[PDB]
């Protein structure tokens, strides 16, 4: 089962042009000086002006298809695999299809959809495509704007969330290019969908139904319990992950390239790595939902210049709560 | 690539258990008797009481692993396929899983969303998943609650809509057994994005930004512009799809088996076909979204004694504009 062909040939990537310092909103709204920073681990973000979500993936999308040396018209299947949604119906496939001119193409444009990891979850879903012989260019966009939803007497809030957009495109490797995925893993304990979840946006609290309360539209989050879902299920996780692949360990990685919602990930990994293991984003984007991961890949090859050949791993937690894990060789 | 060994092991259906006769919103909403059925093709529809869409996917999914002659500990990834969500975050798969009593299970939980079509694209991904041999019992769940959507002002809108979830158990087959998909295809054509879409309920217009619009919550159709999309793509679509399994045709299939959101679909497929031939579920259950297609699917086995080794076909026009069309033995 294991190794599995796999080339992410293309990455791209669109935030927003303009800087938000952390430091501006600290004088703004009457925070300590370096709060971001110590409390979020956040000194700067980026915040939409009038970009819509399929804008900034259809950005994203085209400097990845570029970077694999393709044409638009070469991408035969599209995915989103956003954290939020742009609208109600169509899904983000069709809209960012779209958005890049290719929407008389007939192209199948789809939406996978794991909350936070559901850019992990299309990488795998494209893997089986492509073994399978079904698509051979497979565009992968994950693009959110978070600052839609911003509270501004929470700080806790208001100074966590950054909007932007990363994309990959994924083929089989050519022949005699070792780009493959050594273990893959998804888990999920929906016991703890309560201590992460927005209630609105649905049919179980519709915007004026017989079950809605003041706070539906927020992200509830009980941190202490979601931990506690980590403390019992993540060594057994990571166990069985590792086994997967048992000629390669971590020794063997040169970047952990993690799902970075907040600096506790990081913070885990800068206890257990070595600083330049690790693939660092939200200092300088903040949290950007599912496109946390994405940008960080592309942060590792495009900054870090992890080059084909060398092993990375991607890892991340989000609501459901899931857990995911992936070892590949780039 | 075609023939992919693929079993429908298992199919579960749950309904809102109370008859909402379309004899009785005609007197109670002053619409001529009659009218529903002309008009929409609909005598009868279930509207929830209490439920919420993750207890009618859990009721239909214990039916379809049953079904499949498995208990629930034996399904190794669930698949919400969807038309519509219970909640913004997390998605329908975790939410299902934990209404299932798997929510400590550690079992994959995710969401394929192509709309309309989800439980069609969710098929296809599931079928790769099991001949990647990466999972072994997939199961796949379409629940929706419309009635929460509709205006009572509106007849072509409260007449339309109904509740249900329909779900399957797939794996591969057993040695000898037949079955298989035989041709399978999706096509995007997302410039008709706008003439069937909900422009809420996401970040372009969220609940109060600066692009919210009095009519933001409701489905904006254009009919005339969605046939003209049909007329210019779905031959080609059709030629295409039969052409991957050129040993079998319409004429080797009993059942056709399509998504069913309103009467035009099986009026065209009655001008073709005899009425023998087609699996109605809109008659009794009305539009029940992505509910629709796999409400129709069950309908076949259970009730049109669709036997292991007839072959049937799937179809179905959804927003995106996408198309979808799949050729199985049973």
Aim: charged share 25%; hydrophobic share 40%.
């Amino acid at each position: 089962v294991f190794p599995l062909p796999f080339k992410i040939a293309g990455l791209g990537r669109y935030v927003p042009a303009d800087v938000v310092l952390s430091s501006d909103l600290e004088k703004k709204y009457d925070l300590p000086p370096g709060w971001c920073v110590e409390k979020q681990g956040i000194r700067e973000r980026r915040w939409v002006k009038d970009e819509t979500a399929s804008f900034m993936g259809a950005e994203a999308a085209k400097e990845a298809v570029r970077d694999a040396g393709l044409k638009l018209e070469d991408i035969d299947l599209i995915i989103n695999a956003s954290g939020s949604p742009e609208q109600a119906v169509p899904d983000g496939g069709p809209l960012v299809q779209r958005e890049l001119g290719l929407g008389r193409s007939g192209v199948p444009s789809i939406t996978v959809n794991a909350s936070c990891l559901s850019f992990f979850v299309a990488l795998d879903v494209a893997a089986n495509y492509l073994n399978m012989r079904r698509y051979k260019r497979i565009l992968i966009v994950s693009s959110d704007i978070s600052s839609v939803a911003l509270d501004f007497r929470k700080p806790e809030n208001f100074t966590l969330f950054g909007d932007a957009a990363a994309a990959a495109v994924v083929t089989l490797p050519e022949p005699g290019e070792k780009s493959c995925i050594h273990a893959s893993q998804v888990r999920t304990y929906g016991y703890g969908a309560e201590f992460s979840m927005v209630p609105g946006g649905g049919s179980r609290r519709h915007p004026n139904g017989k079950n809605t309360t003041p706070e539906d539209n927020y992200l509830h989050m009980n941190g202490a319990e979601l931990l506690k879902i980590g403390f019992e299920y993540l060594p057994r996780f990571n166990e069985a992950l590792w086994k997967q692949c048992p000629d390669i360990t971590i020794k063997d990685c040169r970047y952990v390239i993690p799902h970075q919602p907040s600096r506790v990930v990081l913070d885990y990994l800068s206890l257990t790595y070595p600083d330049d293991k690790l693939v660092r984003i939200i200092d300088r984007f903040a949290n950007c939902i599912g496109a946390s991961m994405p940008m960080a890949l592309y942060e590792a090859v495009k900054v870090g210049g992890l080059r084909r050949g060398e092993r990375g791993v991607l890892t991340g937690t989000g609501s459901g709560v899931s857990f995911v894990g992936m070892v590949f060789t780039y």
